[PDB]
PDB file of C-alpha atoms in Angstrom:
ATOM      1  CA  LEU A   1    -123.871 -37.560  10.289  1.00  0.00           C
ATOM      2  CA  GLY A   2    -121.566 -36.471   7.474  1.00  0.00           C
ATOM      3  CA  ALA A   3    -122.077 -32.761   8.154  1.00  0.00           C
ATOM      4  CA  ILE A   4    -118.330 -32.530   8.827  1.00  0.00           C
ATOM      5  CA  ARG A   5    -117.664 -33.736   5.255  1.00  0.00           C
ATOM      6  CA  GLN A   6    -118.623 -30.717   3.105  1.00  0.00           C
ATOM      7  CA  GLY A   7    -117.103 -28.555   5.843  1.00  0.00           C
ATOM      8  CA  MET A   8    -113.778 -30.310   5.236  1.00  0.00           C
ATOM      9  CA  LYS A   9    -114.290 -29.506   1.544  1.00  0.00           C
ATOM     10  CA  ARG A  10    -114.867 -25.934   2.723  1.00  0.00           C
ATOM     11  CA  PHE A  11    -111.608 -26.315   4.677  1.00  0.00           C
ATOM     12  CA  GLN A  12    -110.102 -27.524   1.403  1.00  0.00           C
ATOM     13  CA  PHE A  13    -110.711 -24.130  -0.148  1.00  0.00           C
ATOM     14  CA  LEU A  14    -109.259 -22.568   3.005  1.00  0.00           C
ATOM     15  CA  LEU A  15    -106.078 -24.422   2.065  1.00  0.00           C
ATOM     16  CA  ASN A  16    -106.526 -23.381  -1.593  1.00  0.00           C
ATOM     17  CA  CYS A  17    -105.779 -19.667  -1.099  1.00  0.00           C
ATOM     18  CA  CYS A  18    -103.649 -19.360   2.045  1.00  0.00           C
ATOM     19  CA  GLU A  19     -99.861 -19.323   1.990  1.00  0.00           C
ATOM     20  CA  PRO A  20     -98.093 -22.657   2.581  1.00  0.00           C
ATOM     21  CA  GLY A  21     -95.695 -22.697   5.480  1.00  0.00           C
ATOM     22  CA  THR A  22     -97.789 -20.189   7.454  1.00  0.00           C
ATOM     23  CA  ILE A  23    -101.032 -22.048   8.274  1.00  0.00           C
ATOM     24  CA  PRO A  24    -101.585 -23.651  10.822  1.00  0.00           C
ATOM     25  CA  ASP A  25     -99.714 -22.922  14.050  1.00  0.00           C
ATOM     26  CA  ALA A  26     -97.072 -25.232  15.497  1.00  0.00           C
ATOM     27  CA  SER A  27     -98.632 -25.149  18.963  1.00  0.00           C
ATOM     28  CA  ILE A  28    -102.175 -25.965  17.825  1.00  0.00           C
ATOM     29  CA  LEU A  29    -100.588 -28.739  15.756  1.00  0.00           C
ATOM     30  CA  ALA A  30     -98.822 -29.894  18.924  1.00  0.00           C
ATOM     31  CA  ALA A  31    -101.497 -29.730  21.625  1.00  0.00           C
ATOM     32  CA  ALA A  32    -104.652 -30.838  19.765  1.00  0.00           C
ATOM     33  CA  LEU A  33    -105.264 -34.129  21.573  1.00  0.00           C
ATOM     34  CA  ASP A  34    -106.769 -33.330  25.000  1.00  0.00           C
ATOM     35  CA  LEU A  35    -109.908 -31.561  23.729  1.00  0.00           C
ATOM     36  CA  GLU A  36    -113.382 -32.494  22.461  1.00  0.00           C
ATOM     37  CA  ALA A  37    -112.079 -33.771  19.132  1.00  0.00           C
ATOM     38  CA  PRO A  38    -112.011 -37.459  18.123  1.00  0.00           C
ATOM     39  CA  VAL A  39    -109.332 -39.418  16.280  1.00  0.00           C
ATOM     40  CA  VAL A  40    -111.182 -39.031  12.980  1.00  0.00           C
ATOM     41  CA  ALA A  41    -111.007 -35.222  12.735  1.00  0.00           C
ATOM     42  CA  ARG A  42    -107.298 -35.333  13.634  1.00  0.00           C
ATOM     43  CA  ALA A  43    -106.757 -37.963  10.931  1.00  0.00           C
ATOM     44  CA  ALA A  44    -108.806 -35.884   8.476  1.00  0.00           C
ATOM     45  CA  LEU A  45    -106.564 -32.857   9.128  1.00  0.00           C
ATOM     46  CA  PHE A  46    -103.536 -35.161   8.723  1.00  0.00           C
ATOM     47  CA  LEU A  47    -104.730 -36.483   5.357  1.00  0.00           C
ATOM     48  CA  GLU A  48    -105.718 -32.972   4.180  1.00  0.00           C
ATOM     49  CA  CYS A  49    -102.272 -31.590   5.067  1.00  0.00           C
ATOM     50  CA  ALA A  50    -100.749 -34.619   3.322  1.00  0.00           C
ATOM     51  CA  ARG A  51    -102.976 -33.947   0.286  1.00  0.00           C
ATOM     52  CA  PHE A  52    -101.695 -30.381  -0.040  1.00  0.00           C
ATOM     53  CA  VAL A  53     -98.129 -31.599   0.603  1.00  0.00           C
ATOM     54  CA  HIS A  54     -98.600 -33.960  -2.357  1.00  0.00           C
ATOM     55  CA  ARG A  55     -99.947 -30.958  -4.285  1.00  0.00           C
ATOM     56  CA  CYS A  56     -96.661 -29.191  -3.538  1.00  0.00           C
ATOM     57  CA  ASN A  57     -94.715 -32.401  -4.263  1.00  0.00           C
ATOM     58  CA  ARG A  58     -95.908 -34.248  -7.383  1.00  0.00           C
ATOM     59  CA  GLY A  59     -96.692 -31.367  -9.732  1.00  0.00           C
ATOM     60  CA  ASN A  60    -100.444 -30.822  -9.336  1.00  0.00           C
ATOM     61  CA  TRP A  61    -100.012 -27.227  -8.258  1.00  0.00           C
ATOM     62  CA  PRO A  62    -102.876 -24.747  -7.796  1.00  0.00           C
ATOM     63  CA  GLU A  63    -103.261 -21.852 -10.205  1.00  0.00           C
ATOM     64  CA  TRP A  64    -101.987 -19.135  -7.852  1.00  0.00           C
ATOM     65  CA  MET A  65     -98.929 -21.180  -6.841  1.00  0.00           C
ATOM     66  CA  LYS A  66     -97.784 -20.863 -10.454  1.00  0.00           C
ATOM     67  CA  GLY A  67     -96.695 -17.370 -11.410  1.00  0.00           C
ATOM     68  CA  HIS A  68     -99.503 -16.086 -13.622  1.00  0.00           C
ATOM     69  CA  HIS A  69    -101.369 -13.650 -11.340  1.00  0.00           C
ATOM     70  CA  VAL A  70     -99.082 -10.615 -10.920  1.00  0.00           C
ATOM     71  CA  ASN A  71     -98.567  -9.502 -14.538  1.00  0.00           C
ATOM     72  CA  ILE A  72    -101.933  -7.844 -15.276  1.00  0.00           C
ATOM     73  CA  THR A  73    -101.950  -4.056 -14.857  1.00  0.00           C
ATOM     74  CA  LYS A  74    -104.201  -3.142 -11.931  1.00  0.00           C
ATOM     75  CA  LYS A  75    -105.986   0.212 -11.793  1.00  0.00           C
ATOM     76  CA  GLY A  76    -103.930   1.375  -8.814  1.00  0.00           C
ATOM     77  CA  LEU A  77    -100.305   1.285  -7.518  1.00  0.00           C
ATOM     78  CA  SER A  78     -99.418  -0.767 -10.614  1.00  0.00           C
ATOM     79  CA  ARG A  79     -96.532  -0.754 -13.082  1.00  0.00           C
ATOM     80  CA  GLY A  80     -95.462  -3.133 -15.846  1.00  0.00           C
ATOM     81  CA  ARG A  81     -93.553  -6.070 -14.374  1.00  0.00           C
ATOM     82  CA  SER A  82     -92.896  -9.578 -15.658  1.00  0.00           C
ATOM     83  CA  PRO A  83     -94.549 -12.533 -13.849  1.00  0.00           C
ATOM     84  CA  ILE A  84     -91.116 -14.098 -13.113  1.00  0.00           C
ATOM     85  CA  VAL A  85     -91.349 -12.305  -9.752  1.00  0.00           C
ATOM     86  CA  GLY A  86     -94.541 -14.315  -9.171  1.00  0.00           C
ATOM     87  CA  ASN A  87     -92.471 -17.464  -9.733  1.00  0.00           C
ATOM     88  CA  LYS A  88     -90.114 -16.069  -7.069  1.00  0.00           C
ATOM     89  CA  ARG A  89     -93.230 -15.577  -4.881  1.00  0.00           C
ATOM     90  CA  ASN A  90     -93.990 -19.271  -5.228  1.00  0.00           C
ATOM     91  CA  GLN A  91     -90.336 -19.998  -4.399  1.00  0.00           C
ATOM     92  CA  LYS A  92     -91.036 -17.880  -1.288  1.00  0.00           C
ATOM     93  CA  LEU A  93     -94.095 -19.976  -0.430  1.00  0.00           C
ATOM     94  CA  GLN A  94     -92.224 -23.268  -0.307  1.00  0.00           C
ATOM     95  CA  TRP A  95     -89.328 -21.461   1.408  1.00  0.00           C
ATOM     96  CA  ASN A  96     -91.963 -20.678   4.065  1.00  0.00           C
ATOM     97  CA  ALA A  97     -92.796 -24.371   3.953  1.00  0.00           C
ATOM     98  CA  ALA A  98     -89.477 -26.278   4.007  1.00  0.00           C
ATOM     99  CA  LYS A  99     -88.510 -24.470   7.250  1.00  0.00           C
ATOM    100  CA  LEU A 100     -91.839 -24.294   9.054  1.00  0.00           C
ATOM    101  CA  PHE A 101     -93.040 -27.827   8.200  1.00  0.00           C
ATOM    102  CA  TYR A 102     -89.834 -28.934   9.947  1.00  0.00           C
ATOM    103  CA  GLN A 103     -90.594 -26.686  12.906  1.00  0.00           C
ATOM    104  CA  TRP A 104     -94.273 -27.689  13.215  1.00  0.00           C
ATOM    105  CA  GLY A 105     -93.243 -31.356  12.976  1.00  0.00           C
ATOM    106  CA  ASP A 106     -90.712 -30.601  15.717  1.00  0.00           C
ATOM    107  CA  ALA A 107     -93.417 -29.115  17.917  1.00  0.00           C
ATOM    108  CA  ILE A 108     -95.719 -32.092  17.382  1.00  0.00           C
ATOM    109  CA  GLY A 109     -92.848 -34.518  17.714  1.00  0.00           C
ATOM    110  CA  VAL A 110     -91.459 -33.591  21.128  1.00  0.00           C
ATOM    111  CA  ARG A 111     -95.109 -33.467  22.319  1.00  0.00           C
ATOM    112  CA  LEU A 112     -95.391 -37.077  21.137  1.00  0.00           C
ATOM    113  CA  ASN A 113     -92.168 -37.778  23.040  1.00  0.00           C
ATOM    114  CA  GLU A 114     -94.092 -36.429  26.040  1.00  0.00           C
ATOM    115  CA  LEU A 115     -97.059 -38.589  24.966  1.00  0.00           C
ATOM    116  CA  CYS A 116     -94.851 -41.641  25.570  1.00  0.00           C
ATOM    117  CA  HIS A 117     -95.921 -41.091  29.195  1.00  0.00           C
ATOM    118  CA  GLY A 118     -99.347 -39.849  28.056  1.00  0.00           C
ATOM    119  CA  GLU A 119    -101.104 -43.118  27.181  1.00  0.00           C
ATOM    120  CA  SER A 120     -98.285 -45.205  28.677  1.00  0.00           C
ATOM    121  CA  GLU A 121     -99.617 -48.746  29.005  1.00  0.00           C
ATOM    122  CA  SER A 122     -96.867 -50.303  31.144  1.00  0.00           C
ATOM    123  CA  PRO A 123     -95.145 -53.624  30.319  1.00  0.00           C
ATOM    124  CA  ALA A 124     -96.820 -54.992  33.458  1.00  0.00           C
ATOM    125  CA  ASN A 125    -100.041 -53.449  32.144  1.00  0.00           C
ATOM    126  CA  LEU A 126     -99.191 -55.006  28.761  1.00  0.00           C
ATOM    127  CA  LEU A 127     -98.737 -58.445  30.331  1.00  0.00           C
ATOM    128  CA  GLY A 128    -102.140 -57.916  31.911  1.00  0.00           C
ATOM    129  CA  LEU A 129    -103.425 -56.722  28.525  1.00  0.00           C
ATOM    130  CA  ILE A 130    -102.444 -59.841  26.589  1.00  0.00           C
ATOM    131  CA  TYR A 131    -103.400 -62.589  29.080  1.00  0.00           C
ATOM    132  CA  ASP A 132    -105.903 -61.349  31.694  1.00  0.00           C
ATOM    133  CA  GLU A 133    -109.292 -61.796  30.050  1.00  0.00           C
ATOM    134  CA  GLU A 134    -111.095 -58.667  31.321  1.00  0.00           C
ATOM    135  CA  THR A 135    -109.190 -55.878  29.571  1.00  0.00           C
ATOM    136  CA  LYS A 136    -108.565 -58.438  26.798  1.00  0.00           C
ATOM    137  CA  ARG A 137    -112.274 -58.554  25.963  1.00  0.00           C
ATOM    138  CA  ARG A 138    -112.661 -54.831  26.761  1.00  0.00           C
ATOM    139  CA  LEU A 139    -110.087 -53.544  24.280  1.00  0.00           C
ATOM    140  CA  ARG A 140    -111.008 -56.334  21.844  1.00  0.00           C
ATOM    141  CA  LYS A 141    -114.578 -55.006  21.810  1.00  0.00           C
ATOM    142  CA  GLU A 142    -113.055 -51.530  21.465  1.00  0.00           C
ATOM    143  CA  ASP A 143    -110.901 -52.623  18.501  1.00  0.00           C
ATOM    144  CA  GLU A 144    -113.730 -54.630  16.896  1.00  0.00           C
ATOM    145  CA  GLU A 145    -116.637 -52.153  17.193  1.00  0.00           C
ATOM    146  CA  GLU A 146    -114.229 -49.414  15.962  1.00  0.00           C
ATOM    147  CA  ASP A 147    -116.168 -47.459  13.362  1.00  0.00           C
ATOM    148  CA  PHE A 148    -116.828 -43.746  12.999  1.00  0.00           C
ATOM    149  CA  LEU A 149    -120.562 -43.648  12.258  1.00  0.00           C
ATOM    150  CA  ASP A 150    -121.705 -43.640  15.910  1.00  0.00           C
ATOM    151  CA  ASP A 151    -120.193 -41.112  18.331  1.00  0.00           C
ATOM    152  CA  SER A 152    -121.205 -42.953  21.521  1.00  0.00           C
ATOM    153  CA  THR A 153    -119.041 -46.110  21.744  1.00  0.00           C
ATOM    154  CA  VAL A 154    -115.682 -45.472  20.064  1.00  0.00           C
ATOM    155  CA  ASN A 155    -114.746 -42.242  21.888  1.00  0.00           C
ATOM    156  CA  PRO A 156    -116.513 -41.435  25.195  1.00  0.00           C
ATOM    157  CA  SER A 157    -115.975 -37.680  25.639  1.00  0.00           C
ATOM    158  CA  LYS A 158    -114.336 -37.439  22.172  1.00  0.00           C
ATOM    159  CA  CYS A 159    -110.912 -37.537  23.823  1.00  0.00           C
ATOM    160  CA  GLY A 160    -109.427 -41.001  23.284  1.00  0.00           C
ATOM    161  CA  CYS A 161    -105.946 -41.409  21.821  1.00  0.00           C
ATOM    162  CA  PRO A 162    -105.055 -44.960  20.734  1.00  0.00           C
ATOM    163  CA  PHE A 163    -101.897 -45.968  18.888  1.00  0.00           C
ATOM    164  CA  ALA A 164    -103.666 -45.620  15.513  1.00  0.00           C
ATOM    165  CA  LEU A 165    -103.608 -41.856  16.089  1.00  0.00           C
ATOM    166  CA  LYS A 166     -99.844 -42.160  16.543  1.00  0.00           C
ATOM    167  CA  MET A 167     -99.624 -44.048  13.238  1.00  0.00           C
ATOM    168  CA  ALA A 168    -101.683 -41.244  11.663  1.00  0.00           C
ATOM    169  CA  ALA A 169     -99.170 -38.739  13.035  1.00  0.00           C
ATOM    170  CA  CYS A 170     -96.467 -41.012  11.610  1.00  0.00           C
ATOM    171  CA  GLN A 171     -97.965 -40.933   8.115  1.00  0.00           C
ATOM    172  CA  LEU A 172     -98.374 -37.147   8.305  1.00  0.00           C
ATOM    173  CA  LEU A 173     -94.664 -36.940   9.202  1.00  0.00           C
ATOM    174  CA  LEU A 174     -94.068 -39.436   6.332  1.00  0.00           C
ATOM    175  CA  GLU A 175     -95.569 -36.925   3.877  1.00  0.00           C
ATOM    176  CA  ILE A 176     -93.519 -34.218   5.617  1.00  0.00           C
ATOM    177  CA  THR A 177     -90.433 -36.294   4.731  1.00  0.00           C
ATOM    178  CA  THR A 178     -91.710 -36.677   1.143  1.00  0.00           C
ATOM    179  CA  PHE A 179     -91.689 -32.889   1.024  1.00  0.00           C
ATOM    180  CA  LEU A 180     -88.564 -31.954   2.994  1.00  0.00           C
ATOM    181  CA  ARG A 181     -85.936 -34.220   1.392  1.00  0.00           C
ATOM    182  CA  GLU A 182     -87.009 -33.390  -2.179  1.00  0.00           C
ATOM    183  CA  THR A 183     -88.995 -30.155  -2.519  1.00  0.00           C
ATOM    184  CA  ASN A 184     -82.026 -16.957   4.479  1.00  0.00           C
ATOM    185  CA  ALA A 185     -79.845 -19.599   2.797  1.00  0.00           C
ATOM    186  CA  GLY A 186     -78.082 -21.283   5.726  1.00  0.00           C
ATOM    187  CA  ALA A 187     -80.248 -24.110   7.068  1.00  0.00           C
ATOM    188  CA  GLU A 188     -81.969 -25.167   3.834  1.00  0.00           C
ATOM    189  CA  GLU A 189     -79.898 -28.382   3.774  1.00  0.00           C
ATOM    190  CA  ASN A 190     -79.576 -28.516   7.580  1.00  0.00           C
ATOM    191  CA  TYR A 191     -83.332 -29.192   7.875  1.00  0.00           C
ATOM    192  CA  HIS A 192     -83.312 -32.761   6.602  1.00  0.00           C
ATOM    193  CA  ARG A 193     -80.228 -34.661   7.859  1.00  0.00           C
ATOM    194  CA  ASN A 194     -80.651 -33.770  11.574  1.00  0.00           C
ATOM    195  CA  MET A 195     -84.141 -34.285  13.029  1.00  0.00           C
ATOM    196  CA  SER A 196     -84.440 -33.898  16.804  1.00  0.00           C
ATOM    197  CA  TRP A 197     -87.543 -36.062  17.319  1.00  0.00           C
ATOM    198  CA  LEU A 198     -87.153 -39.314  15.387  1.00  0.00           C
ATOM    199  CA  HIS A 199     -86.111 -41.592  18.244  1.00  0.00           C
ATOM    200  CA  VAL A 200     -89.731 -42.058  19.337  1.00  0.00           C
ATOM    201  CA  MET A 201     -90.816 -43.492  15.967  1.00  0.00           C
ATOM    202  CA  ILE A 202     -88.404 -46.422  16.615  1.00  0.00           C
ATOM    203  CA  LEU A 203     -89.688 -46.387  20.211  1.00  0.00           C
ATOM    204  CA  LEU A 204     -93.247 -46.833  18.887  1.00  0.00           C
ATOM    205  CA  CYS A 205     -91.823 -49.728  16.855  1.00  0.00           C
ATOM    206  CA  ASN A 206     -90.452 -51.048  20.157  1.00  0.00           C
ATOM    207  CA  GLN A 207     -93.984 -50.436  21.403  1.00  0.00           C
ATOM    208  CA  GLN A 208     -94.992 -52.417  18.319  1.00  0.00           C
ATOM    209  CA  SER A 209     -94.426 -55.411  20.559  1.00  0.00           C
ATOM    210  CA  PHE A 210     -94.245 -59.181  20.077  1.00  0.00           C
ATOM    211  CA  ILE A 211     -95.499 -60.809  23.295  1.00  0.00           C
ATOM    212  CA  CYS A 212     -98.771 -61.857  21.629  1.00  0.00           C
ATOM    213  CA  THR A 213    -100.218 -65.351  21.260  1.00  0.00           C
ATOM    214  CA  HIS A 214    -102.858 -64.561  18.553  1.00  0.00           C
ATOM    215  CA  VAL A 215    -105.583 -66.720  20.128  1.00  0.00           C
ATOM    216  CA  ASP A 216    -108.423 -64.566  18.690  1.00  0.00           C
ATOM    217  CA  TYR A 217    -106.756 -61.470  20.228  1.00  0.00           C
ATOM    218  CA  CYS A 218    -103.667 -59.286  20.085  1.00  0.00           C
ATOM    219  CA  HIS A 219    -102.550 -56.857  22.766  1.00  0.00           C
ATOM    220  CA  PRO A 220    -102.828 -53.111  21.876  1.00  0.00           C
ATOM    221  CA  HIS A 221     -99.039 -52.924  21.531  1.00  0.00           C
ATOM    222  CA  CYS A 222     -98.989 -55.820  19.040  1.00  0.00           C
ATOM    223  CA  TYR A 223     -98.776 -54.550  15.459  1.00  0.00           C
ATOM    224  CA  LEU A 224    -101.581 -56.918  14.446  1.00  0.00           C
ATOM    225  CA  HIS A 225    -103.814 -54.995  16.845  1.00  0.00           C
ATOM    226  CA  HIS A 226    -102.401 -51.891  15.137  1.00  0.00           C
ATOM    227  CA  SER A 227    -103.263 -53.492  11.781  1.00  0.00           C
ATOM    228  CA  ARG A 228    -106.840 -54.182  12.907  1.00  0.00           C
ATOM    229  CA  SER A 229    -107.014 -50.625  14.295  1.00  0.00           C
ATOM    230  CA  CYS A 230    -105.902 -48.989  11.040  1.00  0.00           C
ATOM    231  CA  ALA A 231    -108.109 -51.410   9.072  1.00  0.00           C
ATOM    232  CA  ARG A 232    -111.110 -50.358  11.180  1.00  0.00           C
ATOM    233  CA  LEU A 233    -110.276 -46.682  10.667  1.00  0.00           C
ATOM    234  CA  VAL A 234    -109.831 -47.092   6.887  1.00  0.00           C
ATOM    235  CA  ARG A 235    -113.187 -48.926   6.872  1.00  0.00           C
ATOM    236  CA  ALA A 236    -114.618 -45.986   8.849  1.00  0.00           C
ATOM    237  CA  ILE A 237    -113.259 -43.394   6.402  1.00  0.00           C
ATOM    238  CA  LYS A 238    -114.744 -45.425   3.518  1.00  0.00           C
ATOM    239  CA  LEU A 239    -118.122 -45.629   5.279  1.00  0.00           C
ATOM    240  CA  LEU A 240    -118.452 -41.916   6.105  1.00  0.00           C
ATOM    241  CA  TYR A 241    -118.681 -40.620   2.516  1.00  0.00           C
ATOM    242  CA  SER A 242    -114.193 -38.627  -3.411  1.00  0.00           C
ATOM    243  CA  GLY A 243    -111.011 -36.860  -4.486  1.00  0.00           C
ATOM    244  CA  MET A 244    -109.795 -37.101  -0.906  1.00  0.00           C
ATOM    245  CA  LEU A 245    -110.805 -40.763  -1.108  1.00  0.00           C
ATOM    246  CA  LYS A 246    -108.832 -40.796  -4.386  1.00  0.00           C
ATOM    247  CA  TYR A 247    -105.816 -39.530  -2.404  1.00  0.00           C
ATOM    248  CA  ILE A 248    -106.272 -42.171   0.304  1.00  0.00           C
ATOM    249  CA  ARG A 249    -106.640 -44.911  -2.341  1.00  0.00           C
ATOM    250  CA  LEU A 250    -103.577 -43.535  -4.138  1.00  0.00           C
ATOM    251  CA  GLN A 251    -101.257 -43.420  -1.114  1.00  0.00           C
ATOM    252  CA  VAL A 252    -101.641 -45.393   2.130  1.00  0.00           C
ATOM    253  CA  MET A 253    -104.311 -48.208   2.644  1.00  0.00           C
ATOM    254  CA  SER A 254    -102.774 -49.250   6.018  1.00  0.00           C
ATOM    255  CA  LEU A 255    -101.208 -47.140   8.760  1.00  0.00           C
ATOM    256  CA  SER A 256     -99.052 -49.873  10.302  1.00  0.00           C
ATOM    257  CA  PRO A 257     -96.409 -49.775   7.468  1.00  0.00           C
ATOM    258  CA  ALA A 258     -95.793 -46.052   8.113  1.00  0.00           C
ATOM    259  CA  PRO A 259     -92.600 -46.244  10.292  1.00  0.00           C
ATOM    260  CA  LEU A 260     -91.251 -48.909   7.904  1.00  0.00           C
ATOM    261  CA  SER A 261     -91.323 -46.545   4.912  1.00  0.00           C
ATOM    262  CA  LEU A 262     -90.194 -43.807   7.303  1.00  0.00           C
ATOM    263  CA  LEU A 263     -87.074 -45.858   7.988  1.00  0.00           C
ATOM    264  CA  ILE A 264     -86.569 -46.423   4.271  1.00  0.00           C
ATOM    265  CA  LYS A 265     -86.790 -42.647   3.655  1.00  0.00           C
ATOM    266  CA  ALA A 266     -84.397 -41.857   6.567  1.00  0.00           C
ATOM    267  CA  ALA A 267     -81.728 -44.558   6.314  1.00  0.00           C
ATOM    268  CA  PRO A 268     -78.177 -43.059   6.400  1.00  0.00           C
ATOM    269  CA  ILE A 269     -78.426 -40.309   9.072  1.00  0.00           C
ATOM    270  CA  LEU A 270     -78.750 -42.695  12.062  1.00  0.00           C
ATOM    271  CA  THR A 271     -75.871 -43.737  14.329  1.00  0.00           C
ATOM    272  CA  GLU A 272     -75.564 -47.511  14.349  1.00  0.00           C
ATOM    273  CA  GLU A 273     -76.529 -48.185  17.993  1.00  0.00           C
ATOM    274  CA  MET A 274     -80.079 -47.465  16.933  1.00  0.00           C
ATOM    275  CA  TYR A 275     -79.367 -49.821  14.005  1.00  0.00           C
ATOM    276  CA  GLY A 276     -78.377 -52.458  16.598  1.00  0.00           C
ATOM    277  CA  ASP A 277     -81.802 -51.869  18.135  1.00  0.00           C
ATOM    278  CA  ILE A 278     -83.718 -51.919  14.796  1.00  0.00           C
ATOM    279  CA  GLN A 279     -82.457 -55.326  13.535  1.00  0.00           C
ATOM    280  CA  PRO A 280     -84.541 -57.105  16.236  1.00  0.00           C
ATOM    281  CA  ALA A 281     -87.532 -55.081  14.932  1.00  0.00           C
ATOM    282  CA  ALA A 282     -86.531 -56.252  11.477  1.00  0.00           C
ATOM    283  CA  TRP A 283     -86.819 -59.800  12.798  1.00  0.00           C
ATOM    284  CA  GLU A 284     -90.318 -59.302  14.322  1.00  0.00           C
ATOM    285  CA  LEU A 285     -92.091 -57.569  11.401  1.00  0.00           C
ATOM    286  CA  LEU A 286     -91.020 -60.046   8.665  1.00  0.00           C
ATOM    287  CA  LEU A 287     -94.076 -62.217   9.562  1.00  0.00           C
ATOM    288  CA  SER A 288     -96.496 -59.569   8.251  1.00  0.00           C
ATOM    289  CA  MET A 289     -99.342 -60.205   5.782  1.00  0.00           C
ATOM    290  CA  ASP A 290     -99.374 -57.175   3.474  1.00  0.00           C
ATOM    291  CA  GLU A 291     -97.090 -56.821   0.463  1.00  0.00           C
ATOM    292  CA  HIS A 292     -96.443 -53.206   1.510  1.00  0.00           C
ATOM    293  CA  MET A 293     -95.864 -54.066   5.181  1.00  0.00           C
ATOM    294  CA  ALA A 294     -93.800 -57.259   4.893  1.00  0.00           C
ATOM    295  CA  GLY A 295     -92.155 -56.056   1.662  1.00  0.00           C
ATOM    296  CA  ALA A 296     -90.985 -52.816   3.248  1.00  0.00           C
ATOM    297  CA  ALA A 297     -89.850 -54.890   6.232  1.00  0.00           C
ATOM    298  CA  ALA A 298     -87.831 -56.938   3.747  1.00  0.00           C
ATOM    299  CA  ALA A 299     -86.289 -53.806   2.221  1.00  0.00           C
ATOM    300  CA  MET A 300     -85.493 -52.306   5.661  1.00  0.00           C
ATOM    301  CA  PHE A 301     -83.857 -55.598   6.735  1.00  0.00           C
ATOM    302  CA  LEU A 302     -82.046 -55.609   3.363  1.00  0.00           C
ATOM    303  CA  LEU A 303     -80.614 -52.140   3.971  1.00  0.00           C
ATOM    304  CA  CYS A 304     -79.575 -52.817   7.557  1.00  0.00           C
ATOM    305  CA  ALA A 305     -78.032 -56.114   6.398  1.00  0.00           C
ATOM    306  CA  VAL A 306     -75.944 -54.431   3.693  1.00  0.00           C
ATOM    307  CA  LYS A 307     -75.093 -51.878   6.388  1.00  0.00           C
ATOM    308  CA  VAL A 308     -74.368 -54.383   9.181  1.00  0.00           C
ATOM    309  CA  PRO A 309     -74.026 -58.013   8.019  1.00  0.00           C
ATOM    310  CA  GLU A 310     -72.332 -59.377  11.147  1.00  0.00           C
ATOM    311  CA  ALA A 311     -75.421 -59.155  13.373  1.00  0.00           C
ATOM    312  CA  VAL A 312     -77.296 -60.889  10.532  1.00  0.00           C
ATOM    313  CA  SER A 313     -74.512 -63.493  10.460  1.00  0.00           C
ATOM    314  CA  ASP A 314     -74.829 -64.016  14.228  1.00  0.00           C
ATOM    315  CA  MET A 315     -78.608 -64.479  13.942  1.00  0.00           C
ATOM    316  CA  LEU A 316     -77.947 -67.043  11.199  1.00  0.00           C
TER     317      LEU A 316
END
């Protein structure tokens, strides 16, 4: 059952020697949803990429990404040179990254803008989702039996794409923003302030809807159904197995607060019409249960209130 697991560890050494900002491709990062691959392998790739992004972010660098492996005199084509050039090589590696991680996240991101019509459950379909009992009990059984130890119920041809996969893409982009803002000299500062694909994260927050009644059920656009979805997937990833588990237990614990912290990390670049759309979302998510979720909703609402206090004044 866990024969993927060690293979991922094998994949871990395939991200231990290759150059950052070269592997993988933008297009195979974009179009990897309509194949025979479930949500769990996509999320595993997302968390592995995020793990190596945190390796390039916090300070836990690998041995070859610190400049110690070019000084020793080889027995061919070799001459005495200081390893400072190897430090420049590692400055090259993240200069391959800080561009291409932007471009790969572009190529995923506009694909997800096209995936807004991909799994597009209509508002009429949503009003049938929340109240009509048939697809109610259908997707409630699909959200409740959601665990990744049996490959027969949760994903039929290993092709399903719920909104929890979109939150997993959101937390991968979240770690991309932990890299890009902090860690060929023209667009090095032009690749953080202007991102051409961030309107659909707020759109997914508008698809984090609030027409629910919470009588033993939430509709698959309600963020409590998203909370139960990400809770079921975190329970799945803690049933399938430890250092990658260490990373998961050190970072995320719930995928529903991902666009919240995304909006904290990308506050000042937005024009304020989108702010006038995000203060209603600030009203809806302040009923949340987690300290991370409701607390980051409080800090987002705090920042949009110290930005725009008159809409706050009108809703008081």
